[PDB]
Nucleic acid binder design. Structure first.
Lengths: 127, 150, 206, 79, 98, 96, 114
RNA sequence: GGUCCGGCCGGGAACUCAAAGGAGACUGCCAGUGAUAAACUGGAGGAAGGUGGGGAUGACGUCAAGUCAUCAUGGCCCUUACGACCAGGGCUACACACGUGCUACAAUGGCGCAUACAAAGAGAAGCGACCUCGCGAGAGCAAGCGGACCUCAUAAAGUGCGUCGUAGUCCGGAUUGGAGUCUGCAACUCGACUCCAUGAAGUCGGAAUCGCUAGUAAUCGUGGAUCAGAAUGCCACGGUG
C-alpha cells in the first residue's frame, strides 16, 4: 500500500506519500515543476528518488507548508528519503551515506540583548 | 587559534556538479542571493558558445591557468623589523585565490553588465588581460622575485 | 552587582509564588497594586508579630491571604482581636470579601526573613554586629539545615567607610537551581546609614 | 495647517478683538496664546505675544487670514 | 452544547482543575468531546536591570498563559448541573460561555 | 517622584473624568461631522487639566514615569523586585 | 520642438522625457498623454506634428520654466517679507519645514565653514 | 463518501500541529595513540556526538566605577520660601567638532505588470472586516474577535516577461514650494502621514578603525514595548545565505 514519511527542516513540514507506481509528483495541488521547478535548485526533492531509479518506479503525493523554498524543499527530501525506507527497510545505509536520513538540526538563531543581530556586535571604532 | 579540523564540504554546481565550480559561485555570490550568482555566472559560463562554439567546459580551467599563482609574500614580525619571506601556495588556495582575482577584478571592468562583464574576463584570462592576469606577475614580482629573504 | 536573585531564579522550580492567582491586563494593573497595599500594611500592625512570608490566594473577588508567623498566637488576638481587625481591614483596600488564614512557622531559626529581621533589630538595639551576625544567627545550624550564608552591609560600627561582612557555615551552593535556598533581605536604619543584611539558608538539596 | 475643518483660535484673544472692533480701536491687548490664527477681522489691529520674556506687537495685514499668530513672534535669541 | 475553557498560569493548577471536569462534569450524562491543550499565549518582557545607565543591562521575563478547552458536548440537566459544585482553584480562569 | 508631582496626576484623573470622560463626548459630536459649531469648539476650552492626554502614568509604586508597563503599572526596577520576590503572579525569568 | 520653449528632449520615451520640462513630474507628464492619446513607449521623434505639438497644447494649463520659479521666489518672499519664523529662517538658509538645524543640514545651510 | 469545489459537508484520530508526560547521548560500544591511566584521534550506530546548538546561570574581590534622579537614608542645608499653582517659552538652539545609526552612490539595479513561499506576535476609551467615497493619507457606515474561531496582516528577497543601456541617468533621494489628513484644548514655535511640483550632495570614500567562525557574517522583510499621536533607536521573529 502506501508509506508515509514526515520529514522537515528549518521550520518546515513535509508530507510525502509513496505509492507503488505512477512517477507523478504533486505538492499542494501543484507540480514539482510548477511550484519548485525553475527555482534556485529544487532538484533536491526528486534527488533521493532518482538516487535509486524512479519515475517509472513509484508515486509521490506531497503536502508541505513551512519555511521558504530552500527549507520547504529540504523538508520534503527528508520525508521522502524517510518514506522509501518504509517500502524497504534495508536501504538505510545508502540514503544515510548521502546524508538524507538525518535532519538539518541547524535551525535559525535567536537575537540577543546587547548585540544587534544575535551575533553582530555593535561597533566602537574608538576604545 | 589552535583549532584543527577539516574543510567545509561545499555543494557542487547546480548542473555540472563540481566543487571546483561550487565554491566558485559562492566566491562570486553576494548578499546571500546565491540565485543571482548562478544566473549570472552559469550564463556567462555557457555564453562562451557565442565566443567559441563547442563543449565549453575545460575553457574555465584553462582560463584560470593564466591566473594561477604559485608564490606569495608573508611579512613576519622578526629581526626587530618585519620580514617578508615569500612562500609558494598549496593547491587548496591556488584555485580558490585565482577565482577571486577573476571576479573581484571582473566587477571593475565596467562593461554591459556583471553577467557579461564577467564572461569577457574569462576569455581575457586564458588570453592574458585585465587586472586578473596582472595580479599574477604584479604579485610574483615579490616572491621568487625577492628570494633574498625566501 | 553580579549576582542573580537566589529566589526569583528558582521561582519556577522548588519555589512557589507568594501570590498565586489569575488576572487579565484589565484588573491585573490594579490587582498587584492592592496586594501591595494589603501586604505592606499587614506588616505595619504586625511587625513584632514575627511574620515570615505572606501569600495571597485569589479565586474570584475573595483573596485568601496567609500570614506565616513564628508567633501565631500574637497574630491571632484576644480570641478574635487581631484576626477580626485584619480580616476587616481588607475591606475597601480590595473592595472584596477577603479572608485570612494564619500559618505557623516551624523552627523560626531556619526561615530567612525572620533570621534577617531579627539580626537587624538587634543591631538597632546597640549590639555588636559580629556577635549576633555569627552566634545569634548560628542557631540555624543547630536546629538542622546544611549551610547558611549571612551578610551585613557597610557602616557597621563607628566608621564612615562602609564594609561588608562574610561568616558562613555548611554549604550554600546558590549556583544550583535544584538546591533550593531561603534568601531574604532586611534593613536597619540606625543613627547613621542603613546597615543591610542578607540571609542565605541552604535547607537541604533537591 | 492642521485643522482641516474648523480653523481654531484661542478664545482668549477672540473675545478681545471682537471687543476692540466693537468700540473701534485702541492699544494692543496682552496675549499669551500664539497657537491661534491671525483672524481676518483682526486686520490692522494690535496684538502681543509672551515669547517667554515679554510680548511682541502684531499688526494684521490683508494676507494675514489663516496664518498662525505665533509665526510673527520669534522665540530664542540669536546673533 | 455548553463549551468550557480553562486558562491558568501553569499545569500545577490547570491540571487538577481540568481533570476535575472530565471526572466530575463527565460521568454518563455529559458527553465531553475531549480535553484539548490549545496553543499557549506567550508574553515575555525586557526590563533594564540597572537603575539608570548601562543600556547593555536588561532582563527578560515572561508569563505563560496555559489554556485548555475540553468542553462538554451534551446539554442535559443531571450532569450539567454538577459543575457549579466546583469553584476552588486559586487561579484558573473558567470562562463558561456558550 | 516628588510629592507635589505624584499628586497632580491624581487630580488630572478625576477632572478628566467628571468632565471629558463623559461630557467631552457631547462636544465631540458637534465638533465632528454628525449632520462643527464654533461655540462648541470654543466651549471645548472650559477646562484644561481635564484631558485624557495630560496623564503620564507614573509608577504605580513609586512614581517614576520612565519604564511603565500597563501590565504591572510599575517602573522597571519595581517590576524587577516584585518579580524576584514573587509578588507578581506567574512570572519568572525568560529564556529560549 | 521644445514644446514649452527651450530644451529639446529627444531619443527617449515620451512621459519619461516629458518630465524634462522644469515643471512636470513622473505623474503629470503622464496624466497629459492619456488625454492626448500619445503613448509613453513612443520616442518624441516617432511622433508627428499632430503628435508632438499636440502635447504643447494641454501643457499651457500648468505653469513652467522661468516665470514659474520667479512667481514662486516672489510668492515665497510674500510670506517671507512678513516677520514670520519661516521667512526669518528662509532668509538665513535654515530649514523652515522642521529639521534639526542644530546639526546635520549641509544641503540645507550650505558648504562647511570650519 | 456528498460536493452551494472551499476540508465547504458527513465522516475520520491516520498525518501536520497543538502541549502535558516519556525514550534518547554516556566517550556507552569499535580501533589506534598514551605507561595495559586521564584523555586524544578517527569509526559504527543514530535524527542528533565527545559540555549536541543557543540561552539562563557571573567565585574571592578590583575600578572610593555608576545611581541621594526611581526608591530608601546619615549628616548638611532652604522654610511669608532652593515649598506650591497657572500661562507661555525652553530641553528640537548655532558660526564647528566626535561617536552610534538609516538611505545612497546603481544594471548582483531601478520601473511596470504578474505572481510563490515564513516565523514570532498584539488587541473592550481595543484590533477593525466587508462595503461606499477620495488620486491618495484617510473618512462614512458597520460585522467579527475579547481570541489555533476575527482583526491589525492580503510578507520581502524571490521567479516570469519587458524595458531602460553606463550619462549623474530610467540612479539616489536631501531641500523647498503648493495644497492637504489624523491624532489631540491645541500641533507657529515643535508632530506622523498623503498627493503635486522641486530633485542637491553623492560616480564606493586618506590617515586610521569595527563586527563577524555557520544558518554565522551578508542582505530581505514581519511584530512588539513606550504610546492620544513624533522610530531609521531597542527587543524580537523568520526568508535567502
Amino acid at each position: 500500500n502506501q508509506y508515509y514519511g514526515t520529514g522537515r527542516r528549518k521550520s518546515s513540514a513535509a508530507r510525502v506519500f509513496i505509492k507503488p507506481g505512477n512517477g507523478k509528483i504533486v505538492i499542494n495541488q501543484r507540480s514539482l515543476e510548477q511550484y519548485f521547478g525553475r527555482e534556485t535548485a529544487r532538484m533536491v526533492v526528486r534527488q533521493p528518488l532518482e538516487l535509486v531509479d524512479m519515475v517509472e518506479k513509484l508515486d509521490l503525493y506531497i503536502t508541505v507548508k513551512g519555511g521558504g523554498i530552500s527549507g520547504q524543499a529540504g523538508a520534503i527530501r527528508h520525508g521522502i528519503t524517510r518514506a522509501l525506507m518504509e517500502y524497504d527497510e534495508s536501504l538505510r545505509s545508502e540514503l544515510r551515506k548521502a546524508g538524507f536520513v538525518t535532519r538539518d538540526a541547524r535551525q535559525v538563531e535567536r537575537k540577543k540583548v546587547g548585540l544587534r543581530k544575535a551575533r553582530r556586535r555593535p561597533q566602537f571604532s574608538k576604545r | 587559534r589552535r583549532r584543527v579540523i577539516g574543510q567545509r564540504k561545499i555543494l557542487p554546481d547546480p548542473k555540472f556538479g563540481s566543487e571546483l565550480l561550487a565554491k566558485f559561485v559562492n566566491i562570486l555570490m553576494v548578499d546571500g542571493k546565491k540565485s543571482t550568482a548562478e544566473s549570472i555566472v552559469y550564463s556567462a559560463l555557457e555564453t562562451l558558445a557565442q565566443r567559441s562554439g563547442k563543449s565549453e567546459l575545460e575553457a574555465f580551467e584553462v582560463a584560470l591557468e593564466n591566473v594561477r599563482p604559485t608564490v606569495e609574500v608573508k611579512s613576519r614580525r622578526v629581526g626587530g623589523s618585519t620580514y617578508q619571506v615569500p612562500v609558494e601556495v598549496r593547491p587548496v588556495r591556488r584555485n580558490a585565490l585565482a577565482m577571486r582575482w577573476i571576479v573581484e577584478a571582473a566587477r571593475k571592468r565596467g562593461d554591459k553588465s556583471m553577467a557579461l562583464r564577467l564572461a569577457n574576463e574569462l576569455s581575457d584570462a586564458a588570453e592574458n588581460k585585465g587586472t586578473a592576469v596582472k595580479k599574477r606577475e604584479d604579485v610574483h614580482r615579490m616572491a621568487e622575485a625577492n628570494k633574498a629573504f625566501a | 552587582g553580579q549576582k542573580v536573585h537566589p529566589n526569583g531564579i528558582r521561582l519556577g522550580i522548588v519555589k512557589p509564588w507568594n501570590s498565586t492567582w489569575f488576572a487579565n491586563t484589565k484588573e491585573f494593573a490594579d490587582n498587584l497594586d492592592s496586594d501591595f497595599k494589603v501586604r505592606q500594611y499587614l506588616t505595619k500592625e504586625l511587625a513584632k508579630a514575627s511574620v515570615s512570608r505572606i501569600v495571597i490566594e485569589r479565586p474570584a473577588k475573595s483573596i485568601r491571604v496567609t500570614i506565616h508567623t513564628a508567633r501565631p498566637g500574637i497574630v491571632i488576638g484576644k480570641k478574635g482581636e487581631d484576626v477580626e481587625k485584619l480580616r476587616k481591614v481588607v475591606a475597601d483596600i480590595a473592595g472584596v470579601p477577603a479572608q485570612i488564614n494564619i500559618a505557623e512557622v516551624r523552627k523560626p531559626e531556619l526561615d530567612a526573613k525572620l533570621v534577617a529581621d531579627s539580626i537587624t533589630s538587634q543591631l538597632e538595639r546597640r549590639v555588636m554586629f559580629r556577635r549576633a551576625m555569627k552566634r545569634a544567627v548560628q542557631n540555624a545550624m543547630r536546629l538542622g539545615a546544611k549551610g547558611i550564608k549571612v551578610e551585613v552591609s557597610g557602616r557597621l560600627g563607628g566608621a564612615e567607610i562602609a564594609r561588608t561582612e562574610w561568616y558562613r557555615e555548611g554549604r550554600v551552593p546558590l549556583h544550583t537551581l535544584r538546591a533550593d535556598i531561603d534568601y531574604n533581605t532586611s534593613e536597619a536604619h540606625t543613627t547613621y546609614g542603613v546597615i543591610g543584611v542578607k540571609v542565605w539558608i541552604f535547607k537541604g538539596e533537591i | 495647517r492642521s485643522l482641516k475643518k474648523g480653523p481654531f483660535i484661542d478664545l482668549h484673544l477672540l473675545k478681545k478683538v471682537e471687543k476692540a472692533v466693537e468700540s473701534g480701536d485702541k492699544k494692543p491687548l496682552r496675549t499669551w496664546s500664539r497657537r491661534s490664527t491671525i483672524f481676518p477681522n483682526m486686520i490692522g489691529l494690535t496684538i502681543a505675544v509672551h515669547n517667554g520674556r515679554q510680548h511682541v506687537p502684531v499688526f494684521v495685514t490683508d494676507e494675514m487670514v489663516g496664518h498662525k499668530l505665533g509665526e510673527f513672534a520669534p522665540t530664542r535669541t540669536y546673533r | 452544547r455548553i463549551r468550557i475553557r480553562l486558562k491558568a498560569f501553569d499545569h500545577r493548577l490547570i491540571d487538577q482543575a481540568t481533570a476535575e471536569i472530565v471526572e466530575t462534569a463527565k460521568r454518563t450524562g455529559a458527553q465531553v468531546r475531549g480535553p484539548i491543550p490549545l496553543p499557549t499565549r506567550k508574553e515575555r518582557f525586557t526590563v533594564l536591570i540597572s537603575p539608570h545607565v548601562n543600556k547593555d543591562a536588561r532582563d527578560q521575563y515572561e508569563i505563560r498563559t496555559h489554556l485548555r478547552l475540553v468542553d462538554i458536548v451534551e446539554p442535559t440537566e443531571k450532569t450539567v448541573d454538577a459543575l457549579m459544585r466546583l469553584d476552588l482553584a486559586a487561579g484558573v480562569d473558567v470562562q463558561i460561555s456558550l | 517622584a516628588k510629592q507635589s508631582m505624584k499628586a497632580r496626576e491624581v487630580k488630572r484623573v478625576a477632572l478628566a473624568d467628571k468632565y471629558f470622560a463623559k461630557r467631552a463626548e457631547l462636544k465631540a459630536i458637534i465638533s465632528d461631522v454628525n449632520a462643527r459649531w464654533n461655540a462648541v469648539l470654543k466651549l471645548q476650552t472650559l477646562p484644561r487639566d481635564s484631558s485624557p492626554s495630560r496623564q503620564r502614568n507614573r509608577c504605580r509604586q513609586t512614581g517614576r514615569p520612565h519604564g511603565f508597563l500597563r501590565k504591572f503599572g510599575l517602573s522597571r526596577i519595581k517590576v524587577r523586585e516584585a518579580a524576584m520576590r514573587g509578588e507578581i503572579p506567574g512570572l519568572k525569568k525568560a529564556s529560549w | 520642438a521644445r514644446i514649452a520653449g527651450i530644451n529639446i528632449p529627444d531619443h527617449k520615451h515620451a512621459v519619461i522625457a516629458l518630465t524634462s520640462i522644469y515643471g512636470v513630474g513622473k505623474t503629470r507628464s503622464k496624466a497629459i498623454l492619456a488625454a492626448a492619446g500619445i503613448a509613453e513607449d513612443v520616442k518624441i521623434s516617432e511622433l508627428s506634428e499632430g503628435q508632438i505639438d499636440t502635447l504643447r497644447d494641454e501643457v499651457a494649463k500648468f505653469v513652467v520654466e522661468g516665470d514659474l520659479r520667479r512667481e514662486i521666489s516672489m510668492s515665497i518672499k510674500r510670506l517671507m517679507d512678513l516677520g514670520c519664523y519661516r521667512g526669518l529662517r528662509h532668509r538665513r538658509g535654515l530649514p523652515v519645514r522642521g529639521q534639526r538645524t542644530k546639526t546635520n543640514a549641509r544641503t540645507r545651510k550650505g558648504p562647511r565653514k570650519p
